[PDB]
Structure formats: structure tokens, C-alpha cells
Design an enzyme around this catalytic site. Structure first.
Site, short mmCIF file in Angstrom:
data_model
loop_
_atom_site.label_atom_id
_atom_site.label_comp_id
_atom_site.label_asym_id
_atom_site.label_seq_id
_atom_site.Cartn_x
_atom_site.Cartn_y
_atom_site.Cartn_z
N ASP A 8 28.12 14.24 25.24
CA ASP A 8 28.90 14.62 24.06
C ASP A 8 27.98 15.04 22.90
OD1 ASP A 8 30.62 15.06 22.04
OD2 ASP A 8 31.67 13.13 22.16
N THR A 9 27.81 16.35 22.72
CA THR A 9 27.00 16.87 21.63
C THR A 9 27.60 16.60 20.26
OG1 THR A 9 28.03 19.06 21.70
CG2 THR A 9 26.12 18.66 23.13
N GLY A 10 28.88 16.25 20.18
CA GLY A 10 29.49 15.91 18.92
C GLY A 10 29.36 14.46 18.52
C1 LIG Z 1 33.22 13.45 13.99
C2 LIG Z 1 32.90 14.37 15.19
C3 LIG Z 1 33.58 13.92 16.46
C4 LIG Z 1 35.10 13.90 16.28
C5 LIG Z 1 33.06 12.51 16.85
N1 LIG Z 1 33.59 12.08 18.19
C6 LIG Z 1 32.93 12.71 19.42
C7 LIG Z 1 33.93 13.73 19.98
O1 LIG Z 1 33.31 14.48 20.98
C8 LIG Z 1 35.14 13.01 20.57
C9 LIG Z 1 34.78 12.21 21.79
C10 LIG Z 1 36.13 11.66 22.40
C11 LIG Z 1 36.71 12.30 23.69
C12 LIG Z 1 38.05 11.76 24.28
C13 LIG Z 1 38.80 10.60 23.59
C14 LIG Z 1 38.22 9.97 22.29
C15 LIG Z 1 36.86 10.51 21.70
N2 LIG Z 1 36.09 14.04 20.99
C16 LIG Z 1 37.37 14.26 20.25
O2 LIG Z 1 37.72 13.55 19.36
O3 LIG Z 1 38.09 15.37 20.70
C17 LIG Z 1 39.50 15.50 20.26
C18 LIG Z 1 39.69 16.75 20.04
O4 LIG Z 1 39.76 17.38 21.55
C19 LIG Z 1 40.39 16.50 22.28
O5 LIG Z 1 39.61 16.15 23.59
C20 LIG Z 1 39.10 14.93 23.42
C21 LIG Z 1 39.99 14.21 22.27
C22 LIG Z 1 40.44 15.19 21.46
S1 LIG Z 1 33.91 10.40 18.32
O6 LIG Z 1 34.35 9.98 19.65
O7 LIG Z 1 34.99 9.99 17.41
C23 LIG Z 1 32.32 9.65 17.89
C24 LIG Z 1 31.36 9.42 18.91
C25 LIG Z 1 30.05 8.83 18.54
C26 LIG Z 1 29.78 8.47 17.02
C27 LIG Z 1 30.64 8.68 16.12
C28 LIG Z 1 32.06 9.32 16.48
O8 LIG Z 1 30.12 8.26 14.79
C29 LIG Z 1 28.84 8.06 14.95
O9 LIG Z 1 28.61 7.90 16.42
#
Ligand SMILES: CC[C@H](C)CN(C[C@@H](O)[C@H](Cc1ccccc1)NC(=O)O[C@H]1CO[C@H]2OCC[C@H]21)S(=O)(=O)c1ccc2c(c1)OCO2
EC number: 3.4.23.16
Lengths: 99, 99
Positions: free
Chosen positions: B25-27
Site C-alpha cells: 500500500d503506497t498510500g
Molecule cells: C490517508 C491516506 C489513506 C486513506 C490511508 N490509508 C491507506 C489506504 O490505502 C487505505 C487502505 C485500506 C484498504 C481496504 C480497507 C481499509 C483501508 N485504502 C482506502 O481507504 O481506500 C478506500 C478508498 O478505495 C476503497 O478500496 C479500499 C477502501 C476504500 S489507511 O488504511 O487509512 C492508513 C494506513 C497506514 C497509516 C495510516 C492510514 O496513517 C499512518 O499510517
């Protein structure tokens, strides 16, 4: 380009004629942008993240240019903590992970 | 290897003598894993995303293997809906985004 991950992979995008910064987010299925005015019809939808679910407006078939690469697809608008570019658009610009 | 993003970039990881599946997860700034009873001390933390924040336990200097690539660093444990490998470990295995 090749982007390393020592910093957040933030890039400039153009959507609705406006420039913005957004995060290349391989962990997001969908693209979610912070509240903004966008031309087009939309539909209310729900999307869930690490902390629960939020209400968004779904804009379909929206033009959006990501770091100079053009895409046309779904964009969700709502109270996301940051603008994220998800896999639905990352695939369109030819983005892969490599190690 | 090269991983396309048509589907979620799930890979097998080894942590605490257990094999699990997690997203590259690059995000994600940090690595967040499903509840597991790791030994040793930890510090509480809150991390925010779509939907709000969750409470997690921060363990430091944890050994993780990702597709046979070894890394060591901070892992957060809590009620996350999905296991995510964050940039703190992705940099250690030489992972880049390319388009
Ligand atoms: C603030 C930037 C992002 C929203 C951060 N997220 C990583 C995402 O990749 C997250 C990772 C993720 C993936 C599945 C379920 C929950 C979280 N994906 C996500 O929220 O995607 C949503 C939008 O597309 C849909 O597909 C997936 C959920 C929906 S996270 O899960 O909330 C996260 C991870 C590590 C962190 C952090 C936050 O704060 C510091 O360390």
C-alpha cells in the site's frame, strides 16, 4: 516515471480544469477526492476505509490527468482525509508496483 | 517482480512466525496488521483514514518477510479491516511505482 517511497507519492492532478495534489494509493480500490465543485451529474454512495464508512458523491466518466497521464473514470467526492488516486485510475495510466 | 493493479496487490508476509496476506500500500505511511498477539512491549497509537481513526499497538524492530524480501521496522497492530504494508517497509524491499 519511477517513484520511490521514502516520501509520500504525491503528484499534481488536473480535474474539472483545476490543479490539485493527490496521493498515488495502491491500497485504494477507488479514487476519493476532498470536497470540491465538479461539473456533471452524481449519485450518493457509501465508501468504507480503515475507520469506517463515509458518504460521497460519485461522478462517473470524469476526465482527470495524473502526472501528465490522462484517465477517464469514476471519482468519489467527500470527506476523505487526503486526495487519493486509487486503482481504478492507476491502471488507466499504466501504473505497476515493482521490486 | 512487477505487480499490476487490476486487482488488489495482495502478497504473503511472514511476521511473528505466522504467514498472512497483506496489501502493498503506497498510500500507507505505516504498516498496519490485523489483531495478533505479538510478544514484547508496545506503545499506543491512533491512525486516521477514510471513516476516522482506529486505535493500534505500535511494535518496533519487528522482523517481516515480504515475498522473500526481508525487512525490519515498526508494525502497528489493531482492528484494521485489511493488512497493509506501508512505505516504512516498502522502501526496505526496494518497491517503486512505475508508469
Ligand atoms: C490517508 C491516506 C489513506 C486513506 C490511508 N490509508 C491507506 C489506504 O490505502 C487505505 C487502505 C485500506 C484498504 C481496504 C480497507 C481499509 C483501508 N485504502 C482506502 O481507504 O481506500 C478506500 C478508498 O478505495 C476503497 O478500496 C479500499 C477502501 C476504500 S489507511 O488504511 O487509512 C492508513 C494506513 C497506514 C497509516 C495510516 C492510514 O496513517 C499512518 O499510517
Amino acid at each position: 516515471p519511477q517513484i520511490t517511497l521514502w516520501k509520500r507519492p504525491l503528484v499534481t492532478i488536473k480535474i474539472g480544469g483545476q490543479l490539485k495534489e493527490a496521493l498515488l494509493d495502491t491500497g485504494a480500490d477507488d479514487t476519493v477526492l476532498e470536497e470540491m465543485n465538479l461539473p456533471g451529474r452524481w449519485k450518493p454512495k457509501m465508501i468504507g476505509g480503515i475507520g469506517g464508512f463515509i458518504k460521497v458523491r460519485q461522478y462517473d466518466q470524469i476526465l482527470i490527468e495524473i502526472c501528465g497521464h490522462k484517465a477517464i473514470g469514476t471519482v468519489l467526492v467527500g470527506p476523505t482525509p487526503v486526495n487519493v488516486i486509487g486503482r481504478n485510475l492507476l491502471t488507466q495510466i499504466g501504473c505497476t508496483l515493482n521490486f
